[PDB]
Symmetry: C3
Subunit: 332 residues, 3 copies
Amino acid sequence: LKHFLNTQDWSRAELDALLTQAALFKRNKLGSELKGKSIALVFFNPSMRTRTSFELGAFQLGGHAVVLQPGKDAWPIEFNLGTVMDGDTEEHIAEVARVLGRYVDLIGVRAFPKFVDWSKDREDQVLKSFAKYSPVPVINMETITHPCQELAHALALQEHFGTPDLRGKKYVLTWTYHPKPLNTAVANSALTIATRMGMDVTLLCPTPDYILDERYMDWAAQNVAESGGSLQVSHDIDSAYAGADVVYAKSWGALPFFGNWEPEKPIRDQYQHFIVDERKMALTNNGVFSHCLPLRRNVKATDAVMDSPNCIAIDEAENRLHVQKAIMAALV
Amino acid sequence: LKHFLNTQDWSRAELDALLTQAALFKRNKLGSELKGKSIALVFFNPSMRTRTSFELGAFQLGGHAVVLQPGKDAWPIEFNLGTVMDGDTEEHIAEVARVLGRYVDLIGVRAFPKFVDWSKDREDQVLKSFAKYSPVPVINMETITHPCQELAHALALQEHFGTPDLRGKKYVLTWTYHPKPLNTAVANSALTIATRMGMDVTLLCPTPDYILDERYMDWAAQNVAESGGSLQVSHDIDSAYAGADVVYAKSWGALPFFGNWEPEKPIRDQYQHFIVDERKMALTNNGVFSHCLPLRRNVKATDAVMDSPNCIAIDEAENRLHVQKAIMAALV
Amino acid sequence: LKHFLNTQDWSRAELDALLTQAALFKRNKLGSELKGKSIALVFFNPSMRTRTSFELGAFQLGGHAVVLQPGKDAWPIEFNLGTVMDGDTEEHIAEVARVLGRYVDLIGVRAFPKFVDWSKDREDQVLKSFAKYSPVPVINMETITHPCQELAHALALQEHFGTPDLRGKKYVLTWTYHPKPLNTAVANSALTIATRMGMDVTLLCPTPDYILDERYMDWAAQNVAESGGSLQVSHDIDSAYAGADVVYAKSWGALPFFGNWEPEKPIRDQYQHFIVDERKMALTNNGVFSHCLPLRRNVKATDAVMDSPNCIAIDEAENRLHVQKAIMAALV
Ligand SMILES: CC(=O)N[C@@H](CCCNC(=O)CP(=O)(O)O)C(=O)O
Ligand SMILES: CC(=O)N[C@@H](CCCNC(=O)CP(=O)(O)O)C(=O)O
Ligand SMILES: CC(=O)N[C@@H](CCCNC(=O)CP(=O)(O)O)C(=O)O
């Protein structure tokens, strides 16, 4: 059974076919690819774009999305095997995925890490469990990676440069400030897709403590080798932005401080100057800027940057709708 | 771009066309005016009728409504300009409205005042922000006015009297008791639509402290002058109800006590006799009674009044569905 | 007006027609029985299967379900008559049911007992109120009985034995452990449907304190007399399971301890050995096992039992979709 858990699992030809189908759906939004079909959107965390885009996408293709929120409207789910369920969990994922599999044709899942132990969060237990027990295709709506965002981001870049080939472009994935420590998912996905696209990638962050999990650094290295791009970690803002064609900002908490955020709070607080402003964007090569949203203005990016004609964040957000429809159509 | 923020913004011919389209939809509920289209219903406060009527209306016209609840399922939104977003707000309305504008064809918004500072609440910031940044038509699902309710109310009155012309009718908008201070929205809208319809309007309330914001008193005066009706503020129950053709009850907190409700609590508590009972309705001219709902029985109106054949509250509530479909069809 | 509040209210011929229509819908899932129609699913308690199955069922039949959650998204409702609504309740069921009746064609309701006074919970006030004031058919989505579950359960049994006639089969409805006291609804429904099907039923529970309310014991006795089966209460595990063809587990709090759960906590804690494991299932006559879900593994049933080919819980859960579509089609 084929799922969409990570782009890294898909071949380039498959990914390209997805992006092309996405571009096609953007031209002809109404279709019958999901006529009489349905998808269960299981959210363990908040969402505005994801929930809206998937719901509308199912509708535009003649299908129906059922939005569920365990612990809110649906019952809380257990994921550990062989444990004695006497805690807050009412039922086990083995039952949930099998039942849903009798109702819907597709299952989307969103589950952020708990932020207490990266060792456990990095295992992607929720997503894997759904993929393991579900008799129907599973779609990652963001767990520790965000493959749907990668494709929306990629398509938006191809549309901006007027070509499917982004090789050679200088891509800067930069960390930015935020009062609280966030999921690395989007950062991990950006690194993954930018290198898979064969761009010259620079991971710009404050200190080595903010470097992404080895898993994704390794995925990127393997991708660079296969696509002809390049990977590089930098802590110097000015040299990073220099001549950049793309600047993708995202904030995340240092992995080494998982479950121990108190001491890392004073650490990030002294780097809020990583905020993407006009000055830093001025060093780029008339580069485009984007963020996955939700973004806090004057914290992650200044108002000027967000309103500049070079910010393609809205286009990228719109593309979430088109690429997800391509993914559902492919899996169905 | 044309929005439906307040009936006061629309011409009489436009309003009449809306009410007639509403009456038409009531006869033929299924249509294709919204085929393949969608509306984002953004609720910042609870709702039963509004959410249900809009959702079904979109469905009956071949479209789809996506229900969102910032702070609940969607991310909390910021509205102030140029501020440093380091508080509870994750993203700015500028982004939210622009993103939604890439997904849906219409945006409905419901946001009650915060009840801390009327000076700020009366600015209708949420609604205006959506209308400002949204590339698609915005619909007021109740903020400080409730235009959708005005039309449902108006249509129900025209159907009751068997005519579109309500000029000459004596209309009594009366305050009623409630343990807590409420939004003036419905009261403001009633005053607005009743005068726009050219009726002889009497705003019956306990003391001058309960008179509506000048903005709406002025809208009503201008409406009276243009339609040939009349406006009047009264604090005497018996003289108000006398010979009335319509009695519309609603409770609201005194504007002068915004952000300082403690001292106004003992003030309303001594006027719970404003409750619409058989006695007061007996003074009317076989007048009809209505309320926007949700209504607390034996507090705002007695059981007898609510069950009398003269209560048209259910009909008015049903009409929310029909007029809103007319509004969406017109804006699309 | 015909509602679906309990199977006990329906004749055998009607019930059989429902199960047959259900089997038919399972073969041809898409239809037009609810084209342009809608159902309001009012949930006062959590749900995953019920909400999903009804929502999809409405969609597959060309209709639309509107999901509501009083106190969450919709306004809190009052049910007592003639009371002064100055509490947490904003509106009365008389208004709610009448309004909904102007919007939707069907009303589903889910409302578990409050667990403070069985004398009040057993009156089924919410369900009855909706059925009383609603101008359109009402469907029990589980209150103190769960008729939709009975039919899903019944159909699954008929499919398992390859016949509509389950007379003669030995049916064991057994109590099982759970850290907290639960609703007896499913247990009451199982007893009701198993006897209505004319099986030899044994209610296996720890002590006489766990025997179901007389109402359902009496329904079962009347059913046994009419169908030719048999009813029996047992407290001995081994003799109960012996030669059983069906084993339906469910946990519930002792009725005599309603509103006084502290002393019954230590009572159930000494019977967690009622958990359906391989040993007990080994005594059966190659009997099938099922549970309504959500089920806690290793608490209500061991992992081995849940994964055995004799567990038909997933099939039964799937059938919720098919029988509910038959019910809606019949009531519409
Ligand atoms: C700060 C926070 O917790 N945010 C998420 C945003 C994920 C990307 N954003 C989306 O997928 C858009 P939506 O569907 O509206 O959430 C994160 O940092 O991982
Ligand atoms: C007491 C309270 O906060 N209520 C609101 C009711 C608004 C009119 N009522 C509606 O639009 C009906 P629904 O969509 O179900 O809320 C108010 O007083 O402004
Ligand atoms: C422990 C608990 O409170 N549970 C309920 C389950 C009812 C049957 N189960 C269902 O109808 C499935 P769903 O629609 O997902 O709830 C009870 O014991 O009465």
